[PDB]
Design a protein around this ligand. Structure first.
Ligand SMILES: Nc1ncc(Cc2ccccc2)s1
Lengths: 336, 20
């Protein structure tokens, strides 16, 4: 583990300090369908012509990123992704830019989001939820060892692969920080109290978000919901959680320690760090090595119909890609 | 029920990130 993480960091740091740039070009890909949208572009299913490999290409309109003041966040995202390498993180295959846009070509993960299956089925059994929770526990131990805070855990951002294992996507808010940080970002249901209250905060916000996730998986709804974000915030800072009567007592206790307002008491945030979580009774049946190596059988394998099938994703209205004749925001994105 | 209160709320679709 220590020795895993030592090698992981050496590996990461080389790429961190010398980021890969300009490793493909748009005209090498055949565009097929939109798998998702966002405030600065979309993710499209695409085909790499030279190989016949399918990928998910994220396109960001440089002008939109600038307007929304997300330049630094966007350079974080690319610089981190090109440098990390973990089984439960979607791989960045290529990245490039043109006059108008930024492009991040990711590994295509055809099983769709946990969100979809979670909403459809209603809720996951404790074993089913424990299985995905353990993959996140290891993923955060990997990312936090690298000084990386993730900051957007939610079922919408966890993709299910062909083996029924999770792949974390969307690094738009990930940041390499040694001390504390202040940006208000993330998703309302998943924000730790520190964030809402404009305190400086650190990685402990990822562990809190883990408690929100685990609870959502196992209850079928989040511990703090309302029709408007400000009503959600009050619920979160009051730190009053009710559990479904079906919740096992081990689960209720883990959740009490994860969704802990007092940072000297929050699991992940103490002298033993991540082992508080890994050693908790709820996880007693978890074989950590076998999860990492993917030899545990998944509770659920997605229905697969083809290499480039898209039915596990919602439909989205297409929009043509226009590339301007003039370079936009060149200086802002020169390191991209 | 809490489930019923959830299902009837405006937040059962995909949830957008906030920032600033
Ligand atoms: N690698 C990817 N496969 C499908 C994707 C669309 C998507 C992207 C982000 C969050 C949810 C869904 S990204």
């Amino acid at each position: 583990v220590k020795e895993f993480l030592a090698k992981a960091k050496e590996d990461f740091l080389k790429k961190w300090e010398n980021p890969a740039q300009n490793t493909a070009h748009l005209d090498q890909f055949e565009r097929i369908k939109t798998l998702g949208t966002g405030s600065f572009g979309r993710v499209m299913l695409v085909k790499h012509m030279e190989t016949g490999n399918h990928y998910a290409m994220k396109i960001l309109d440089k002008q939109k990123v600038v307007k929304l003041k997300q330049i630094e966040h966007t350079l974080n995202e690319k610089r981190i992704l090109q440098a990390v390498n973990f089984p439960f993180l979607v791989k960045l295959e290529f990245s490039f830019k043109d006059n108008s846009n930024l492009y991040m070509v990711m590994e295509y993960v055809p099983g769709g989001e946990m969100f979809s299956h979670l909403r459809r089925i209603g809720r996951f059994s404790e074993p089913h939820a424990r299985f995905y929770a353990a993959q996140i526990v290891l993923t955060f131990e990997y990312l936090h060892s690298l000084d990386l805070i993730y900051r957007d855990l939610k079922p919408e951002n966890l993709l299910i692969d062909q083996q029924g294992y999770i792949q974390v996507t969307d690094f738009g808010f990930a940041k390499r920080v040694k001390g504390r940080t202040w940006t208000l970002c993330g998703t309302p249901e998943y924000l730790a109290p520190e964030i809402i209250l404009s305190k400086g905060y650190n990685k402990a916000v990822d562990w809190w978000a883990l408690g929100v996730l685990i609870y959502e998986m196992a209850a079928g709804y989040p511990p703090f919901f309302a029709d408007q974000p400000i009503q959600i915030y009050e619920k979160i800072v009051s730190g009053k959680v009710r559990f479904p009567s079906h919740f096992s007592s081990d689960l209720k206790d883990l959740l009490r320690n994860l969704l802990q307002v007092d940072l000297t008491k929050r699991f992940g945030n103490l002298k033993d760090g991540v082992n508080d979580i890994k050693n908790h009774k709820w996880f007693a049946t978890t074989d950590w090595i076998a999860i990492y190596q993917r030899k545990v059988e998944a509770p659920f394998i997605p229905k697969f119909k083809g290499p480039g099938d898209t039915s596990n994703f919602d439909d989205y209205e297409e929009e043509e890609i226009r590339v301007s004749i003039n370079e936009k925001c060149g200086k802002e994105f020169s390191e991209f | 029920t809490t489930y019923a209160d959830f299902i009837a709320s405006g937040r059962t679709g995909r949830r957008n990130a906030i920032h600033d």
